[PDB]
Amino acid sequence: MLQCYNCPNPTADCKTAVNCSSDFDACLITKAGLQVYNKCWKFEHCNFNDVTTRLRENELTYYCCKKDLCNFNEQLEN
């Protein structure tokens, strides 16, 4: 199974780790100013249009990775 950080709400050091459901195939991180997001996601959902609309953020950086629990804060320098 996919395994990622998947915090319920933006958390500057997301510790909540889960096996993702079959809905997900990637681990996303996004840094969005104050906010940080770590989610079960998909590489097809790793597109700026999606991340920007779904987060409702004006300025952000995001990264996606396949390895277990790999989406963590220091992965983004922003």
């Binding site: 990637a26 790793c46 597109n47 950086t61 990264y63 922003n78």
Partner: protein, 76 residues
Amino acid sequence: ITSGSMGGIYEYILVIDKAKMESLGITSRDITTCFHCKKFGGGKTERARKAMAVEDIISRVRGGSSGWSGGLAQNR
């Protein structure tokens, strides 16, 4: 007073002014690489809209009955 005209006057003015301005901007980068394979994206988008309208009407009648001075002030 030492001159005259007796009569009636009607005057009507309508001005309307409207404006709309909208703009949208976006700049984005997406990257992927493999050595384990890795994918990044980063960018910004801004949007603005404004709309303005003013409608000003003045109608006035100087003349001969309250009834039809009012009626003509309403509906030419």
